[PDB]
Swiss-Prot record:
Sorted UniProt keywords: Apoptosis, Cytoplasm, Developmental protein, Differentiation, Isopeptide bond, Membrane, Mitochondrion, Nucleus, Phosphoprotein, Transmembrane, Transmembrane helix, Ubl conjugation
Outcome when changing K26R: Reduced ubiquitination
Entry keyword annotation includes Mitochondrion: yes
Residue window of motif BH3: 38-52
PTM text: Cleaved by CASP3 during apoptosis.
Organism of provenance: Homo sapiens (Human)
Protein name, as recorded: Induced myeloid leukemia cell differentiation protein Mcl-1
Residues of the full protein shown: 172 to 326 of 350
Function, as annotated: Involved in the regulation of apoptosis versus cell survival, and in the maintenance of viability but not of proliferation. Mediates its effects by interactions with a number of other regulators of apoptosis. Isoform 1 inhibits apoptosis. Isoform 2 promotes apoptosis.
Gene designation per UniProt: MCL1
Cross-link Glycyl lysine isopeptide (Lys-Gly) (interchain with G-Cter in ubiquitin): residue positions: K23, K26
Motif BH2: chain residues: 133-148
Localization terms from the record: Membrane; Cytoplasm; Mitochondrion; Nucleus, Nucleoplasm
One GO molecular-function entry: protein transmembrane transporter activity
Record keyword Transmembrane present: yes
Length: 155
């Protein structure tokens, strides 16, 4: 399942980067060039999303009250409720992943880094297992990269 594998790698790397502040230097798996560009795009766009929605993100994090592995496990149900049961577009997919990064950073602050990879797996499961049809139709991660591509300015 290439789409799942690729999704997991991109989402897992971004959440880990966000939490630890360091880039993972290991090579990507299959489709490395696209996964690299997708991660680069997520960085650029996701970092802005977390700031543009700072108040809402903080509000939701407080409401969720995440303390441990049990709370983190409970998040899949909330993601299905809020993300899956709605219109699909790349903006909403970015909010899904960007809030995940926000949560991962919170997990590092409370010294619960071990829950970050499980969280990335949960997000990937929700995204891929509930929106595969849309993802395929939108050209998957190549489409994500194409959608957010910005041309260089003249001069
Ligand atoms: C119209 C702009 C929308 C962005 C602004 C939305 C803000 C919301 O008030 C909440 C702040 C976080 C947003 C809710 N979720 C996050 C979500 C549900 C809560 C648990 C959770 C846990 C993880 Cl680890 C990851 C995500 C979540 C589900 O993901 C999404 C996805 C899309 C939106 C909101 C959430 C959304 O409304 N996006 S928007 O339309 O771009």
């Amino acid at each position: 399942d290439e789409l799942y594998r690729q999704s997991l790698e991109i989402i897992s790397r971004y959440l880990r980067e966000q939490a630890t502040g360091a880039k993972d230097t290991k090579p990507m798996g299959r489709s490395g060039a696209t996964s690299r560009k997708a991660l680069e795009t997520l960085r650029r766009v996701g970092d802005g999303v977390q700031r543009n929605h700072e108040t809402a993100f903080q509000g939701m994090l407080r409401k969720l009250d995440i303390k441990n592995e049990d709370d983190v496990k409970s998040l899949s149900r909330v993601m299905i409720h809020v993300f899956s049961d709605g219109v699909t577009n790349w903006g909403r997919i970015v909010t899904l992943i960007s809030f995940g990064a926000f949560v991962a950073k919170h997990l590092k602050t409370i010294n619960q880094e071990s829950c970050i990879e499980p969280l990335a797996e949960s997000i990937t499961d929700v995204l891929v297992r509930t929106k595969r049809d849309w993802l395929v139709k939108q050209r998957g991660w190549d489409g994500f990269v194409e959608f957010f591509h910005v041309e260089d300015l003249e001069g």
